[PDB]
Structure 1
Amino acid sequence: EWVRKADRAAGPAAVLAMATANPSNFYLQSDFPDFYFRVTRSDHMSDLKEKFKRICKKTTVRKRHMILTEEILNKNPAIADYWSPSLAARHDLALANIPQLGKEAADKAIKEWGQPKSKITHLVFCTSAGVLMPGADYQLTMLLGLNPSISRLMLHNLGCYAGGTALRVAKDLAENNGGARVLVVCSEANLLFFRGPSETHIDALITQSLFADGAAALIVGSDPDLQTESPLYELISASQRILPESEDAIVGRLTEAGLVPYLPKDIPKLVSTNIRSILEDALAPTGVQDWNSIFWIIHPGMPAILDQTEKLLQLDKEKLKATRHVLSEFGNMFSATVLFILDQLRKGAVAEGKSTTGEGCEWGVLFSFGPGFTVETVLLRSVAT
């Protein structure tokens, strides 16, 4: 069967531009334990400091960018406390930083896109760094001077899987509206999760070794004008799933002291048990049987999950090179991380001179996860270079 266009778009949603941004301030992971235990004014609990240095090394993280400097923490000592009333102070930092960080990435993505920002018709904006009313989707619309009649979707506090959510949402917006151009911005920071240490709570300590700050911006649209627009990826399918027997695996309670995490269940084992059937469900319409003929983007929120997935599917240990690079160079930037990885993978494909934006492969899978236990899966199709 066939129907007229009317107002809808013909082809699948395509990623037409991507860019990233980070706060200028960064910390090297080798220096972080000394800095962390100093500024949280917690040098005495030396056994925990030794635990943190062991934890920090096995993250395989090299540096992380952070809004929170020593001076800012000194002007907001409640943030450095393990648990003190500090939500308003964190949200004042989110208001001064999160939309601005999203604008730095968006400006670069619009620069690569090359079209007037007046053609942007939708904005999807995700952050777990601060609940603002009006949201950072509004603040960005004002800072960027986007059209006042843009269709916005503000996604607060979905957690680490919201990178895939943002693509899943943009896919339906672009494909159902002719001429629609969707600005996608995940702007993330540890502003709600940062806190001092306590031997009573080690879940919080592990999160202090990984979470970092950064923004990723994308332009998504269907039916590209192939003269002025150059697609990088095609969004072919996008799905969400709650894993069986995963109740309360990842829980973040928003309190007077910010976001406090809770992680009872063994997350690597949940992913390992379910990863294969999810992936071959996503690959079902492609005709791919060898898992090494596709490109890969896995949310590196737990580095062990990269290792066990690599060995379980017997991946070529260069398949996750882009994923491990972003992890090492930036840490876990919440929902932005998998879009950082999509960008690094694109740049490395161009750099090393492969035939496709997907490192020489045609098909690729993007896989992120978070509270639920929730998995977002996106099937991507590369573009010849």
Structure 2
Amino acid sequence: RKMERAEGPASVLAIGTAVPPNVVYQKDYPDFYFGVTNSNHKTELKDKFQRMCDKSCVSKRHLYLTEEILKANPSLCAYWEPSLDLRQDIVVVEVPKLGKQAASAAIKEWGQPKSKITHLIFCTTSGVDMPGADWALAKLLGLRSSVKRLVLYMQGCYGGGTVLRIAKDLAENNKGARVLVVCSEITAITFRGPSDTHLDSLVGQALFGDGASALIVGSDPVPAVERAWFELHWTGSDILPNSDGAIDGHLKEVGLTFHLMKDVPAIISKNIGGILKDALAKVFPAAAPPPPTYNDLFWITHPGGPAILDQVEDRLGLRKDKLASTRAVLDQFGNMSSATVLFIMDEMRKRSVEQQLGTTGEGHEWGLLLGFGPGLTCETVVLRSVPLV
């Protein structure tokens, strides 16, 4: 008359990632972007975009859109031309497909048959449809027809925190539940030509890349059969003060548009300390061990842009190595919206194993995953690593 619940903390049992094969190196992107968009005559706009690329701390990105595809579809290279139907036709197909590559890698690592997946969460900011990308992914994988699905559309850059916040309750409240979590982002929904009109969209052109990540999340891993890599222990969500309209995105007839105030780094950096201090106080209450210091935590931080990272690091006084895993993903992949923190989680555990650190969190026991996006919404997850060998 009842659904048995699980006992232990929701745990990450496997991670997979996937990116489009086409690589664009940042040194080449100003020429490329202004070339295929027919805007090289816009001489001062391009110098402005060159400075954004020079400062982006992005070396390369993987992009579904190629010069050939852009040549085939000139309404994408144009500026403010109607093109949503064209964008949707692309991403309603390619977002689940990219997600399927990451999902198959995570399942292969996990090692159990795909029919043990009981739940699915699909998160994307690229396109919407009915049935949704969750249904399409289930069809592509051949998941059981009774998988409990959830599609999280139009989330944006905090979505990596959101999927963990939901997956935690699904795994913990359902005995045996194994949650496939996929975030998949493809910039074909936003890509548009340059214009002194909208210097916000330029920022997006310098930073956003494509990618998908997949997790298996479940409570009570079977001993010597499944392997936990991180545990979810505490979650919080906050709308930061005086941030109305900081980050807005609209799905228009010209596609997805992006609006971004210059004070996003300030708003984030100046509020994040109180959020983290409160979260750590709840996880480590006095009544008892004190919370670890920031430098004794591992850090999985959504790299909205280098200015956000630099100002957060400065305001919290983080030692300069704490954001190294985060900054490596931004350098090699750019900002992949909701998927990015799961790429960072993967990079951190793999570094930790390769370098024989004592835990999956670079040697630290406790850790923080942060997502930031429209709201301005800050998603906080307190994680525990797992000891290695």
Partner secondary structure for residue 209 of structure 1? helix
Partner secondary structure for residue 17 of structure 2? strand
* 2:237 alignment counterpart: 240
Structure 1: 4+ residue segments shifted above 6 A: none
1:246–1:265 contact (8 Å) kept in structure 2: no
2:270–2:315 contact (8 Å) kept in structure 1: no
Percent of residue pairs identical: 59
* 2:294 alignment counterpart: 291
Q: What per-residue deviation string (whole Å, max 9, x for no partner) do you get for residues 72-112 of structure 1?
A: 11111111112100001111111331111001001110011
* 1:270 alignment counterpart: 267
Q: Following TM superposition, by how much is the alpha carbon of 1:264 offset from its aligned partner in structure 2, in angstroms?
A: 3.0
Partner secondary structure for residue 208 of structure 1? helix
Alignment of 1:134-213 (within 5 A): 134-213=131-210
* 2:108 alignment counterpart: 111
Q: Following TM superposition, by how much is the alpha carbon of 1:221 offset from its aligned partner in structure 2, in angstroms?
A: 0.2
Q: Following TM superposition, by how much is the alpha carbon of 1:312 offset from its aligned partner in structure 2, in angstroms?
A: 1.8
Q: Which amino acid aligns with 1:34?
A: D
* 2:383 alignment counterpart: 380
Q: What per-residue deviation string (whole Å, max 9, x for no partner) do you get for residues 316-351 of structure 1?
A: 211111100000000000100011001101111111
Matched, 1:304 2:307: yes
1:249–1:371 contact (8 Å) kept in structure 2: yes
* 2:22 alignment counterpart: 25
Structure 2 unpaired stretches of 5+ = 285-289
Q: Whole-Å Cα distance in 2 between the matches of residues 26 and 87 of structure 1? A: 25
Q: Whole-Å Cα distance in 1 between the matches of residues 55 and 350 of structure 2? A: 27
Q: Whole-Å Cα distance in 2 between the matches of residues 23 and 198 of structure 1? A: 27
* 1:225 alignment counterpart: 222
Q: Whole-Å Cα distance in 2 between the matches of residues 328 and 253 of structure 1? A: 27
2:3–2:174 contact (8 Å) kept in structure 1: no
Distance change >3 Å, CA 281–CA 171, structure 1 → 2: same
Alignment of 1:50-61 (within 5 A): 50-61=47-58
Q: What per-residue deviation string (whole Å, max 9, x for no partner) do you get for residues 331-382 of structure 1?
A: 0001000110011011111111100001100000001110001000000000
Q: Whole-Å Cα distance in 2 between the matches of residues 236 and 68 of structure 1? A: 38
Matched, 1:328 2:328: no
Q: What per-residue deviation string (whole Å, max 9, x for no partner) do you get for residues 226-254 of structure 1?
A: 12101000000112111111111111111
Partner secondary structure for residue 292 of structure 1? helix
For residue 77 of structure 2, the aligned residue among 76, 80, 98 is: 80
For residue 38 of structure 2, the aligned residue among 12, 27, 41 is: 41
Partner secondary structure for residue 367 of structure 1? strand
Structure 1 unpaired stretches of 5+ = none
Q: Whole-Å Cα distance in 2 between the matches of residues 37 and 354 of structure 1? A: 44
CA-based RMSD = 1.2
Q: Following TM superposition, by how much is the alpha carbon of 1:289 offset from its aligned partner in structure 2, in angstroms?
A: 4.4
Q: Whole-Å Cα distance in 2 between the matches of residues 84 and 247 of structure 1? A: 28
Q: Which amino acid aligns with 2:260?
A: L
Q: Whole-Å Cα distance in 2 between the matches of residues 194 and 232 of structure 1? A: 35
Q: Whole-Å Cα distance in 1 between the matches of residues 80 and 342 of structure 2? A: 32
Partner secondary structure for residue 324 of structure 1? helix
Partner secondary structure for residue 149 of structure 1? coil
Partner secondary structure for residue 30 of structure 1? helix
1:137–1:154 contact (8 Å) kept in structure 2: yes
Q: Whole-Å Cα distance in 1 between the matches of residues 222 and 41 of structure 2? A: 62
Q: Following TM superposition, by how much is the alpha carbon of 1:269 offset from its aligned partner in structure 2, in angstroms?
A: 1.0
Q: What per-residue deviation string (whole Å, max 9, x for no partner) do you get for residues 112-170 of structure 1?
A: 10001100000000011111211111111001000010000000111110000000010
Q: Whole-Å Cα distance in 2 between the matches of residues 368 and 10 of structure 1? A: 27
In the superposition, the TM-score normalised over structure 2's length comes to 0.96
The alignment of Structure 1 onto Structure 2 pairs a total of residues equal to: 382
Q: Which amino acid aligns with 2:314?
A: K
1:130–1:191 contact (8 Å) kept in structure 2: no
Matched, 1:89 2:86: yes
Q: Whole-Å Cα distance in 2 between the matches of residues 55 and 218 of structure 1? A: 33
1:17–1:232 contact (8 Å) kept in structure 2: yes
1:164–1:378 contact (8 Å) kept in structure 2: yes
Q: Following TM superposition, by how much is the alpha carbon of 1:194 offset from its aligned partner in structure 2, in angstroms?
A: 0.6
